[PDB]
Amino acid sequence: ERVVINVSGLRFETQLKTLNQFPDTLLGNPQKRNRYYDPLRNEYFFDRNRPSFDAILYFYQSGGRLRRPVDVPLDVFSEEIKFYELGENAFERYREDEGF
Incomplete structure (x- = not known):
């Protein structure tokens, strides 16, 4: 199944298996991402x-590689990884990488 994730008009496509590999994340958990399903557009x-999303998606495609894009403020991106619920063990690698 091809999944279409529409972020403010920019559509990203990925395979369901790809998202499911991180089952305790907003996108990897059907009960969580479904709260965001648009019945009208599928x-x-x-x-x-x-701009934060290339990085959220590469996180899944790469097997857990969490890198903030150079032009996304520390605060914007941190709010985003928190919302997509990427997990404590990656918020940590992310913190170590950034300075805190």
């Missing part, structure tokens, strides 16, 4: 920061 819609 895609999940997020009214959020666009």
Whole structure:
């Protein structure tokens, strides 16, 4: 199944297996991402920061590689990884990498 994730108009596509590999994340948990399902367009819609998403998605494709894009403020991106609930063990690697 191809999944279409629509972030403020920018559509990202990925395979269901890819998201499911991190089952305790907003996107990896059907009960969580479904709260965001758009029945009308058959895609999940997020009214959020666009540039932060390449990184949220690569996190799943890469097997857990969490890198903030150079042009996304520390605070914007941190709010985003928190919302997508990427997990304590990655918020940590993220913290070590950033300075705190």
